[PDB]
Amino acid sequence: MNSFYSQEELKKIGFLSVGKNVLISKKASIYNPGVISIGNNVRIDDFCILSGKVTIGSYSHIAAYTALYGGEVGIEMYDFANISSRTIVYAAIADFSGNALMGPTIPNQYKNVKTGKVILKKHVIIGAHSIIFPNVVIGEGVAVGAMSMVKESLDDWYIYVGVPVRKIKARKRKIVELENEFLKSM
Amino acid sequence: MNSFYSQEELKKIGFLSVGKNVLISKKASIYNPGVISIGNNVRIDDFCILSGKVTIGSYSHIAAYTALYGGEVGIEMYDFANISSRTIVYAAIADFSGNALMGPTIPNQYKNVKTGKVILKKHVIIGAHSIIFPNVVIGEGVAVGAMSMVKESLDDWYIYVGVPVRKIKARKRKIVELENEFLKSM
Amino acid sequence: NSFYSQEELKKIGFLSVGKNVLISKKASIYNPGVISIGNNVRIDDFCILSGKVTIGSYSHIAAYTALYGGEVGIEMYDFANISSRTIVYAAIADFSGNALMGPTIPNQYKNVKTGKVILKKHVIIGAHSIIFPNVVIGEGVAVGAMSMVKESLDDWYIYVGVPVRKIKARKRKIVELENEFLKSMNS
Ligand SMILES: CC(C)(COP(=O)(O)OP(=O)(O)OC[C@H]1O[C@@H](n2cnc3c(N)ncnc32)[C@H](O)[C@@H]1OP(=O)(O)O)[C@@H](O)C(=O)NCCC(=O)NCCS
Ligand SMILES: CC(C)(COP(=O)(O)OP(=O)(O)OC[C@H]1O[C@@H](n2cnc3c(N)ncnc32)[C@H](O)[C@@H]1OP(=O)(O)O)[C@@H](O)C(=O)NCCC(=O)NCCS
Ligand SMILES: CC(C)(COP(=O)(O)OP(=O)(O)OC[C@H]1O[C@@H](n2cnc3c(N)ncnc32)[C@H](O)[C@@H]1OP(=O)(O)O)[C@@H](O)C(=O)NCCC(=O)NCCS
Ligand SMILES: Cc1cn([C@H]2C[C@H](O)[C@@H](COP(=O)(O)OP(=O)(O)O)O2)c(=O)[nH]c1=O
Ligand SMILES: Cc1cn([C@H]2C[C@H](O)[C@@H](COP(=O)(O)OP(=O)(O)O)O2)c(=O)[nH]c1=O
Ligand SMILES: Cc1cn([C@H]2C[C@H](O)[C@@H](COP(=O)(O)OP(=O)(O)O)O2)c(=O)[nH]c1=O
Ligand SMILES: [Cl-]
């Protein structure tokens, strides 16, 4: 079979805005859809979680198990950005240093949250099993390899790997031509 | 909207025990509820799996996709200990050496199950995508980085990172004061 | 427990399927008509099977494991098991910047990497691991946890790392044990 909402059920969800050809699995979780926005030709697979301010452009695959903890400051993805399975992107994290208490259970005034908008520029691919922390921009046409971790903004058009990531080599810009060629025949 | 049980439904699950202000997603999986006790101010998110022997104290977040398999020896977590998304704590793990058959499709004679209780002491924080193997004491105040793997027990108030983890710096103890400051005003 | 009844299962429509095959109701099966399962097989909560998967016998597919069979398929031999939160890909999008990617985009603009994934006998894949397309995991190999595998792996070794490196011989005791269990089945 397949797991997706129909254009009908989509509409009843109460999204800030949702495009056309949007396939979201009923096996995903959508928290606070009133601030979640989806452009066109998007797919979100089983067991993803979207919570808080999330904005996705058009022609993005969010693969299974991927969590987007958009918070109040948000996560945004430009067009042709894609995220492989089991990725987490965080717009807000707790403070591990030992200088604060943490998580939901604890009153704000004792915490020390790290928070910043997270943006994923065009043509970003995020490898399977990766993590992106708050306040970072992943640069235009960056690929980040599998099982990688990102704590900082990434320079455009490079491939990064590792925990935390290191720049391994350039990203081909050939996606750009194709983007245009594809867009042409629309 | 949230996916959590009403206190009504909670009790019709029947845990060895279960405190108050305890939010557990309906999208989580609780097996063997009668071997799980749960304190107060505790939250378990979508897609988690609790299995068998699990003891959770008070003031704890267990983030989504987290699996606690406590089989018979169990997992025990103190107060103010937290677990980030997508972690596994294993109280029992198969012998990988070549010397044994494995998993639930096989009789136990042909198996060499390494088992051993897992404890996470006050203020432990496990970061996301982490694994804890059996027979491990995560000392009080220990922070383990995201995408870390833990085989040995670990020293109080330190920060560990890697696969397998290694010690990289002392955790601050100021959270001691804040615990106090905080329980103080109740 | 989570599993489908024997009645519930023959209702899914698996190409083939055997007996004592416990499958969680919280796992996701896609195109069951191209998925054969042997006997004594466990698939836990939140797994995803999609496309050509063949699984033999005495196998555990731990919680959260995704097997993306595609056309080419993923094949496991008997006594192979996979641990929680693993991903097996028989197809994957070229990352180089030489092509677009995803089901959002028409086939011509992509440069999809494809190939059979075979998990031979006694294979054990550790937890949180990723295995790529066109990859033969050799007989009685163990890959550790959090491991990444992009090329074929030689018989009877332990492998760890991202990407994997060979670390030690895996012991073959397991083969005698196998025989002993199989005989104890007969007499
Ligand atoms: C990052 C990636 C694209 C690089 O592939 P590549 O161009 O073949 O690069 P190579 O395999 O030659 O390796 C280059 C270096 O990076 C390392 N490396 C490659 N992938 C890595 C990863 N995910 N994490 C850490 N290191 C990695 C290799 O060790 C090698 O190291 P060295 O330079 O010290 O020898 C690929 O390894 C990858 O991670 N793909 C993820 C696939 C995915 O997530 N798919 C989801 C479904 S579509
Ligand atoms: C543990 C952590 C807090 C430490 O970061 P930090 O205090 O800023 O210290 P640094 O980032 O300078 O890291 C120190 C070193 O460890 C390495 N390192 C840091 N985090 C690592 C990790 N998770 N795994 C492997 N290595 C890590 C870095 O390469 C650096 O190496 P070096 O000693 O060769 O320079 C952070 O990196 C981390 O892993 N956080 C997890 C957060 C999380 O899981 N959040 C879930 C949402 S609440
Ligand atoms: C693969 C495994 C069995 C190897 O364990 P081992 O035989 O105890 O080997 P050791 O602990 O001596 O370590 C061998 C080396 O590999 C490294 N290593 C071990 N496991 C690793 C892993 N998963 N990833 C990366 N490196 C690893 C160690 O740092 C050590 O390094 P060195 O030789 O360079 O000093 C074990 O490490 C493991 O990962 N088991 C996974 C368990 C699991 O996934 N279980 C599912 C539950 S049923
Ligand atoms: C992975 C996945 C697939 N499916 C369905 C829709 C897809 O068209 C079909 C198989 O697609 P998929 O498994 O993503 O492979 P492909 O790359 O060929 O699209 O199964 C879901 O409904 N939900 C899911 O989470
Ligand atoms: C992640 C998650 C959120 N929610 C709901 C309940 C929470 O009150 C709300 C906020 O979730 P969350 O994303 O954890 O935000 P915060 O970090 O501010 O708590 O979303 C669930 O019900 N289940 C979940 O698994
Ligand atoms: C982990 C898990 C357990 N269960 C059920 C079946 C088991 O009888 C019981 C305990 O499971 P588990 O912790 O897997 O025990 P074992 O090590 O014996 O396999 O809970 C599921 O249905 N699905 C799951 O994903
Ligand atoms: Cl997961």
* DSSP symbols for B104-133: TTS-GGGB--EE--EEE-TT-EEPTT-EE-
Contact B9/B27 with Cβ under 8 angstroms?
no
Per DSSP, helices labelled H in A25-169 are none
Q: Whose CA is nearest to atom 40 of ligand 2?
A: B145
Measured CA angle at C127 (ends A67, C78), to 5 deg? 125
Chain C interface includes B92 (CB < 8 A): no
Interface check A47 vs B, CB under 8 A: yes
- Distance in Å, CA C146 to ligand 3 centroid: 10
Q: Is residue B37 part of a domain?
A: yes
**Other Cβ atoms within 10 Å of B112 Cβ, number:** 16
**Cα separations (Å) of A88 from A135, B100, B126, C46?**
14, 35, 15, 17
- Resolution in angstroms comes to 2.5
The answer to whether A40 and A58 have CB atoms below 8 angstroms apart is: yes
In a domain, A178, yes or no: no
Cα separation, A56 vs B90, whole angstroms: 36
Please state, in angstroms and rounded to a whole number, the distance separating the CA atoms of residues A28 and B135.
Answer: 34
Q: How many CB atoms lie within 10 A of CB A52?
A: 18
**How many domains does chain B divide into?**
1
Would C94 be classed as within a structural domain?
Answer: yes
CATH of the domain at C25: 2.160.10.10
Q: Name the pairing type of β-strands A158-161 and A137-138.
A: unpaired
The nearest alpha carbon in chain A to B157 belongs to A98
Measured in Å, residue C70 CA sits from the centre of ligand 4 at 9
* Distances from the Cα of C129 to the Cα of A136, C30, C125, C155, angstroms: 26, 22, 7, 18
User: How does C80-112 read in b/e, with b if 16+ C-beta sit within 10 Å?
Assistant: bbbbbbbbbbbbbbbbebebbbbbbbeeeebee
Only one residue has tokens 């601050």, namely B172
- Tell me the ligand closest to A113's alpha carbon: 2
C1 CA distance to ligand 6 centroid (A)?
7
Q: 10 Å Cβ neighbour count for B168?
A: 11
Q: In the 8-state DSSP scheme, what is residue C174?
A: H
The method recorded for this entry reads X-ray
Alpha carbons A26 and A12: distance in angstroms, whole number: 13
In a domain, A47, yes or no: yes
Q: Is the CB of A148 under 6 A from ligand 1?
A: yes
| Cβ partners under 8 Å of residue A186, min gap 6 | none
Of B42, B125, B146, the CB nearest to A149: B146
Contacts of residue A168, Cβ cutoff 8 Å, sequence gap at least 6: A145, A158, A159, A160, A161
Taking alpha carbons only, the member of B123, B58, B48, B139 closest to residue B89 is: B48
Judge whether A62 is closer than 8 Å to chain C, CB to CB. Answer: no
CB of C67 closer than 8 Å to CB of C85: no
Closest residue to C104, CB basis, from A43, A47, A129: A43
Contact B126, B90 (CB under 8 A): no
* Structural domain span for residue B103: 1-171
Distance C69 CA to ligand 4 centre (A): 10
- Measured CA to CA, the distance from residue A125 to residue A117 in angstroms comes to 18
Output the CA–CA distances (angstroms, integers) from residue A86 to B45, B87, B141, C22, in the order listed: 16, 12, 28, 25
- Which residue has tokens 């993805």? A77
Q: Do B88 and C172 touch (CB under 8 A)?
A: no
Q: Mark out the alpha helices in C6-139 (DSSP H runs).
A: 6-10
* Ion ligand 7 residue ranges (Cβ < 5 Å): A 65, 86; B 65; C 64, 85
d(Cα B148, Cα B86) in Å, to the nearest integer? 12
Q: Are the beta carbons of C76 and C57 closer than 8 angstroms?
A: no
The enclosing H or E element of B9 equals: helix B7-11
A112 three-class SS:
coil
- A78 found inside a domain: yes
**What is the per-residue burial (b if ≥16 Cβ within 10 Å, else e) of B38-70?**
bbebbbbbbbbbbbbbbbbbbbbbbbbbbbbbb
Asked if residue A182 belongs to a domain, the reply is: no
B81 within a domain of the structure (yes/no): yes
- Is position B1 within any domain? yes
Q: Measure the CA–CA gap between A10 and C151, rounded to whole angstroms.
A: 41
Q: Which of C60, C76, C87, C94 is nearest to C146 (CA)?
A: C87
Which of the ligands is closest to the CA of residue B84? 2
C94 touches chain B (CB under 8 A): no
Smallest CA–CA distance, residue B34 to chain A, in Å, is 24
Chain A residues whose beta carbon lies within 8 Å of the beta carbon of residue B62: none
